Amino acid sequence: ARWFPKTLPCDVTLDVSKNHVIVDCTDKHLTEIPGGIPTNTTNLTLTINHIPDISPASFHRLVHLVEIDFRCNCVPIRLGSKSNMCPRRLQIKPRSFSGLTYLKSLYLDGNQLLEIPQGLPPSLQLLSLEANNIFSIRKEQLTELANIEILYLGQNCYYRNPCYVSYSIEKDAFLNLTKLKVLSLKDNNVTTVPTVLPSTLTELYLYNNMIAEIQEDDFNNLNQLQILDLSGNCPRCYNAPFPCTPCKNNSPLQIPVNAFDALTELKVLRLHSNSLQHVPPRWFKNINNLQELDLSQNFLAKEIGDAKFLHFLPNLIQLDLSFNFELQVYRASMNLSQAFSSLKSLKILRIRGYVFKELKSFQLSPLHNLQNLEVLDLGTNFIKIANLSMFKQFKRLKVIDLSVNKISPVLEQLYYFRYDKYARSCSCYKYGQTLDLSKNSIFFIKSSDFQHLSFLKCLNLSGNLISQTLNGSEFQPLAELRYLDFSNNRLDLLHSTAFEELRKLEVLDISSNSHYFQSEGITHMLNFTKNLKVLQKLMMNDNDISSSTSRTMESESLRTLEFRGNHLDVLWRDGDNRYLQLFKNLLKLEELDISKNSLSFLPSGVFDGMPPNLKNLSLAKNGLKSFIWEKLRYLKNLETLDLSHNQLTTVPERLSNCSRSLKNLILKNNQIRSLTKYFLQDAFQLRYLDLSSNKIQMIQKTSFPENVLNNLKMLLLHHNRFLCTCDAVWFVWWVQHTEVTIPYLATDVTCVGPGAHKGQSVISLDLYTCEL
Amino acid sequence: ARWFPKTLPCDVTLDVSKNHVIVDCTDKHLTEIPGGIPTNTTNLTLTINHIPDISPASFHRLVHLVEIDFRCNCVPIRLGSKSNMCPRRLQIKPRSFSGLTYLKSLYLDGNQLLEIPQGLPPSLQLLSLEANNIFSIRKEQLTELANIEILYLGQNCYYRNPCYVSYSIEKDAFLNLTKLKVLSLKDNNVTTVPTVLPSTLTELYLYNNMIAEIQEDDFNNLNQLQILDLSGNCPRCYNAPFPCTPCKNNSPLQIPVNAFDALTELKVLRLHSNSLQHVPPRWFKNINNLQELDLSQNFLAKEIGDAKFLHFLPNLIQLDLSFNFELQVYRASMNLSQAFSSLKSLKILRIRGYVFKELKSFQLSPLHNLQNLEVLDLGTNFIKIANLSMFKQFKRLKVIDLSVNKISPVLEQLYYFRYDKYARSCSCYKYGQTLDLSKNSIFFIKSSDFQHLSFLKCLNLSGNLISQTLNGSEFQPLAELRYLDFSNNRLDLLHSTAFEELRKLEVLDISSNSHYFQSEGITHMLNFTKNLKVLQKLMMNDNDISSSTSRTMESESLRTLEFRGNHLDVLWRDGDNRYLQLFKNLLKLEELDISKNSLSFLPSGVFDGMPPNLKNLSLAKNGLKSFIWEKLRYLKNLETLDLSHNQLTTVPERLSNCSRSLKNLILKNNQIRSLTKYFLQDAFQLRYLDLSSNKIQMIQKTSFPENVLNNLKMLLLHHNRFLCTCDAVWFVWWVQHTEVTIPYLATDVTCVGPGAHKGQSVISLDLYTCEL
Ligand SMILES: *[C@@H]1O[C@H](CO)[C@@H](O[C@@H]2O[C@H](CO)[C@@H](O)[C@H](O)[C@H]2NC(C)=O)[C@H](O)[C@H]1NC(C)=O
Ligand SMILES: *[C@@H]1O[C@H](CO)[C@@H](O[C@@H]2O[C@H](CO)[C@@H](O)[C@H](O)[C@H]2NC(C)=O)[C@H](O)[C@H]1NC(C)=O
Ligand SMILES: *[C@@H]1O[C@H](CO)[C@@H](O[C@@H]2O[C@H](CO)[C@@H](O)[C@H](O)[C@H]2NC(C)=O)[C@H](O)[C@H]1NC(C)=O
Ligand SMILES: *[C@@H]1O[C@H](CO)[C@@H](O[C@@H]2O[C@H](CO)[C@@H](O)[C@H](O)[C@H]2NC(C)=O)[C@H](O)[C@H]1NC(C)=O
Ligand SMILES: CCNCc1nc2c(N)nc3ccccc3c2n1CC(C)(C)O
Ligand SMILES: CCNCc1nc2c(N)nc3ccccc3c2n1CC(C)(C)O
Ligand SMILES: *[C@@H]1O[C@H](CO)[C@@H](O)[C@H](O)[C@H]1NC(C)=O
Ligand SMILES: *[C@@H]1O[C@H](CO)[C@@H](O)[C@H](O)[C@H]1NC(C)=O
Ligand SMILES: *[C@@H]1O[C@H](CO)[C@@H](O)[C@H](O)[C@H]1NC(C)=O
Ligand SMILES: *[C@@H]1O[C@H](CO)[C@@H](O)[C@H](O)[C@H]1NC(C)=O
Ligand SMILES: *[C@@H]1O[C@H](CO)[C@@H](O)[C@H](O)[C@H]1NC(C)=O
Ligand SMILES: *[C@@H]1O[C@H](CO)[C@@H](O)[C@H](O)[C@H]1NC(C)=O
Ligand SMILES: *[C@@H]1O[C@H](CO)[C@@H](O)[C@H](O)[C@H]1NC(C)=O
Ligand SMILES: *[C@@H]1O[C@H](CO)[C@@H](O)[C@H](O)[C@H]1NC(C)=O
Ligand SMILES: *[C@@H]1O[C@H](CO)[C@@H](O)[C@H](O)[C@H]1NC(C)=O
Ligand SMILES: *[C@@H]1O[C@H](CO)[C@@H](O)[C@H](O)[C@H]1NC(C)=O
Ligand SMILES: *[C@@H]1O[C@H](CO)[C@@H](O)[C@H](O)[C@H]1NC(C)=O
């Protein structure tokens, strides 16, 4: 199928439309730039290798390069692997880049460089030098960058990559960069705003530095600026997860009342962790276009009850005031200034970490007539009391977020406290109105708790303390609810009428409710599904279910059942036939996950007990030591079979004789040491096959007929025990010449032997002596 | 050191005092009895192999055998491995046992035998034939057993090993076994009590059968019987975890009032799962000695309120009345008859599964003057209300068990419901008075909850819903408490005064309280230990701890800290020095478990930050990819180092130069491929070394000096990658001749190659061609 096998250890992709030739050698354990890179290459990526040097030889033939991505070949010690430390900084020899007349983007982040690389071609639009050791910026070193438009210099002096001095920037070092639009000097030990900056700037990132004061004219000429981030200058250090040094005298970042007067195009202003105690209204007198304001992690608790500056922000879309509470103070209630009602455009309001005992409806009246408000986030406030009926006046909202509180009758998990959320490395909302009560202290629920909340589409009760026999009465008002997340509670399924009042429920999650399933003698009605007439997906993972009072689960609607992390091995104890049809009467079930059920064997009868339309079956991670492949004939609609992470040792003699429907067969991480002689014969309908991480030594053509292989959408073979003897000649030739997608050919499709060939890639194997 | 290497794949022990030669071939994957078993062998065990036959050659030379243990070489299908099913039942040829003039004990359980083996020697005292296929007992087949005292015939016809007919016993089949003391016919589909039985019987096991009625004279002659078990005849089938057929019309096992009149020596009567509705006092008229009565899994709920029979049981030690509740009945309270007060000798009372809402002090008054009472078990009753102060009248008890209830302001976990708790296979009580409130619904606690309970030594609150900031006030009456189990709650360690009122506390378990450690920005005072002045052991496993407001834990008493299952990798983020001394001021800490903390590397400063008297350190299961062995020099008292289940690839060049104190070094399940040339040179304090489950190919003599090997109590080497070439000549010879204890030589110290030798045990390897 190929006359010239590809030996290059990189992926090569063809973007005919914009004439791009993409060569991606990411994470190929290279110690040199590989030979034979195509001369037409436009995008060359060498990220995460151990190439110690660049020289004119490096890209000599590659005159068409628009982008070199050479990140993280020598990353700073505390940021990189401690098992493969980089011994010496990347060495760049003169005029390695000057021949590349078309080069627009150069990424050299994370190479321990000491100076800005010189000799760069004047076509360059983007230069990236994050996580190097460059902490002095001189005008002279920037002359080469006349046409530069995006310049990243951050992370060159901070606690994970120290330079032990203040960052240095020469007066007007950036000024004659007349095209520069984005400048990022974050995480750099910078002490003053650099001046004068070019008025072309649209984005300026100065956050996480040691700037104590803003001068009146620091931003005087920047009439095109759209994003300004000054966060983390004079940080609020309480409970900081990183080493945190505050400004002296509990000082805030000092910003003169007129400092932003020139910023008429500013759409985003970030003032997170600046220890602000006041927000002067005068700041925003000439900014009418501001859309996003971040004021989290300051000391604005009292300002929130006053907040006159809000009257100047009628175009604001997002307001963040999270974590402004006064230390050691547990307020009685939330005091929102009436000025919030002048925020006519607000869609997102976040006030986590205000820290107060009781929320009452009148406290939210300033928001009552904000017509665009879509998200109200009051998480992590330790609220003990809130009458949920209160939110009848907020039907228009998409998400009401009370997550992580103490109520009783999606942002990353580190978000407000992490050092740099934007550091670069080397859900039920769509169903409609969401009330998120997850991670609260709700121990008991009753219908009145949800009075006037009939409009709700998703209710998140995950991680409460609900330890209750539901009988169909607790959710009566929730007549529109489509999604209930009830995971991490203590559901007691005594009654098969549980949840039946949720007559429009489509998704139910009762995962991690194992408490009552763990003790003998307790009644469990797993047939509670019959009463849920539009239920589409049921999750009951990690419930430790090893017994059931009912012997069948019933549903004519359910299409997906997740049953992972239970004890079907106990339910299907050999000799006990009573539960072999547990799933049989889920007539429209197509996907069944019964991985992690300690199923070391399948008793006869489980396959005949499967419902008739089963399409996706997972039996992964069961410790399965044997498997009657012929029993797959009962599964007449089977398309995906996941047998990964087991102890299987054989494949079927004729996959076509076991299932002439199967498309995806996943056998990774088993103990298979050989294939049957006619394994895939006539298995035409097959499209995806994972044999990786087994012990296969040989594969002959009879097992892998090409009438089958070339309609394979992927074939995974890596991490086996291939023996590269003259018996392997067909397999080696076929692998070298096939166009079927096989991952990790360059890195993990390897001979274990004999001796000479140990560790050698099958792709590079020369077997001419077999033909002499 | 040995002139004749042992090649026999069995363990051989010498018990010089009792003149025993013990040969243990348990689970050696033998398909034949090995040659060369010592002629003096007295105890031979071949359990769990695949030896298909026994013949006169089997034990030909072994005339001194007192015991043959040949269990489970062909186990019934539903009881055995489905990956290695036994193809044909064990074959015993004639006269295989008659030459064994001293044979006292013969175990042939689980071999699918069809008849009682004939030709047995007249010395035999014990025959065991459980889990075979013998379901007709004839007097003729028993004549050979004249001297038998112990006969196990159960598990030959039941749902896990069906015979599809009723068990058959000939009239007086057992009568002429005049020495028989123990007869077990459990799990056999028996339909009547066999008669007449020999009057020597002391123990009769007839449980899990199909006996519907006892005849009035079925036990008439058994004036020596001490234990009678008739349980599981007419079973109580509700929520049974095995296929269960009740007698119909809800009939009980029918027992005439005089059926026990002859059993004057009876000490144990088991009537579990017999569907009893009454316990006639007349049953016990001539049983004056009964000590143990099991009446669990009947329908005695109403009888418990009357219970006139208890007046005839003044010597009873143990009474079990668990799971007698009426189906679908949730009683208001528990009604214990006054007759319980006549149980003068009672030590243990178990009444689980009575199922009632409210426990109150007056309900237990019949027990107030039972002076010998030690255990009151009221678990699994769904009690919602209980004033714990009532147990002030129960200071003499050792354990008050309210586990698994719904209270709100040690038996196996399958015990009452499993089919045969005695089926054979092929904790804080010690501190004093214990109140076990585990697995209840306690969400909030206050001091008054423990009013009058100052005598308690151990309190188990595990698995409740306590989601509360403790501040030192909640446990004030518990002035003698030595052990608090607070695991699986939702501890909020806001205050460093938590638990400080428990001034005699020695052990605290706060494991699996991860809830509030999972959300960012929440204050955690891990320095709460300072106030606990006699605390010896602290468990805080599986708390997901990744942040702390305090930087150090402090204690003058703590000796053991379990800190497993947290995120020290995040706390010790490279470049953040603030937590590197978290444990430094636990000045008396001797044991530290920080396994499972995602520590893929150890930041420098961790070892210098350890407290000075640390002796046992676990770093297991961390994904550790590298390790600076020289840093062990900081741990001048280190004796045990557990690095198991990591990714290490090297050992130190000279262990003695890293730690002068190290005695136990555990390196199992790593990636070590070779040892350093002088690894163990002069490591004179080393005593235990585990290198199993690595990738070692070769070991040379320089690495293993003999003056060090002579002090090793164990050296574990199994499951490596040994290369059995002429280069391995020292190691192969040394392994064959050493006296150092090396486990699994017979089974898992194996050549991986070259070719001819794959799978061969190095103990069997012949390398003479290397020496020609
Ligand atoms: C190949 O490299 C070019 C050069 O950087 C990439 O083109 C840039 O793509 C971003 C994505 O929107 C644009 O903002 C830049 O303006 C583009 N620059 C030019 C000169 O066109 C391109 O994305 C890369 N393609 C791949 C597949 O890596
Ligand atoms: C940021 O710059 C400060 C100084 O502006 C550095 O602090 C100095 O560090 C040296 C070397 O450790 C000390 O000897 C001086 O006493 C420090 N001076 C002051 C004024 O603090 C600091 O190390 C730099 N931070 C990083 C992360 O590189
Ligand atoms: C070796 O076999 C003898 C004979 O079966 C065992 O001796 C019996 O041990 C039990 C347990 O202590 C006693 O109750 C019996 O009284 C002993 N004698 C008989 C005739 O059964 C002995 O325990 C075995 N030893 C080992 C190490 O297996
Ligand atoms: C226990 O004995 C009964 C008979 O006393 C067995 O039941 C019979 O089984 C055969 C074949 O399965 C049926 O055709 C009969 O109808 C059954 N008879 C009755 C009276 O039910 C039963 O199989 C035996 N149990 C075991 C585990 O062997
Ligand atoms: C040993 C009990 N077995 C049956 C049983 N199961 C449960 C259960 N899951 N939850 C409960 C919650 C409250 C009260 C009782 C139960 C209960 N009961 C007892 C009864 C309702 C009479 O069936
Ligand atoms: C945003 C969190 N700031 C630190 C904090 N942690 C906790 C905690 N673990 N538990 C609590 C329980 C009740 C009320 C408050 C807290 C609380 N607070 C707030 C503080 C003012 C210090 O009390
Ligand atoms: C809220 O705070 C504001 C300003 O700090 C002030 O009007 C008043 O003290 C508070 N009002 C209420 C109703 O609590
Ligand atoms: C909660 O508020 C609603 C107002 O919609 C009211 O109907 C209900 O009585 C209140 N409940 C409590 C417990 O205050
Ligand atoms: C419910 O909230 C939990 C806890 O934050 C979250 O992990 C989960 O994804 C949410 N469920 C849905 C369906 O969004
Ligand atoms: C369900 O339980 C609720 C809550 O206690 C109760 O009001 C109602 O009577 C019960 N309904 C049924 C049908 O059992
Ligand atoms: C589920 O099975 C139990 C078994 O007794 C039965 O009581 C109940 O009627 C069944 N489920 C229904 C009716 O949804
Ligand atoms: C308890 O039940 C027994 C049995 O019916 C009855 O005789 C007795 O009067 C009851 N006593 C109480 C206090 O309920
Ligand atoms: C519990 O009983 C004790 C009697 O020892 C009494 O002092 C206390 O008031 C009772 N508590 C409650 C809540 O009834
Ligand atoms: C407390 O009870 C739990 C739950 O039953 C049990 O697992 C644990 O071992 C008990 N703790 C002690 C110290 O006995
Ligand atoms: C500790 O909490 C208890 C329970 O609310 C309270 O009574 C007590 O005053 C608190 N003590 C301190 C010192 O805050
Ligand atoms: C624990 O350490 C913190 C330091 O963050 C301090 O506020 C507190 O007083 C300390 N408490 C004790 C008991 O040492
Ligand atoms: C390790 O060995 C070197 C060289 O023999 C010696 O100088 C050094 O003191 C030793 N260190 C320890 C801790 O034994």
UniProtKB/TrEMBL annotation, chains A, B:
Any one GO biological process: positive regulation of interferon-beta production
Location(s) in or outside the cell: Endomembrane system; Endosome
Gene Ontology CC annotations of this record: endolysosome membrane; endoplasmic reticulum
Record has Kinase as a keyword: no
Superkingdom of source: Eukaryota
Record-annotated disulphide pairs: 10-25, 72-426, 74-86, 157-163, 234-247, 237-244, 428-458, 724-751, 726-770
Stated name of the protein: Toll-like receptor 7
Included stretch of the parent chain: 23 to 831 of 1045
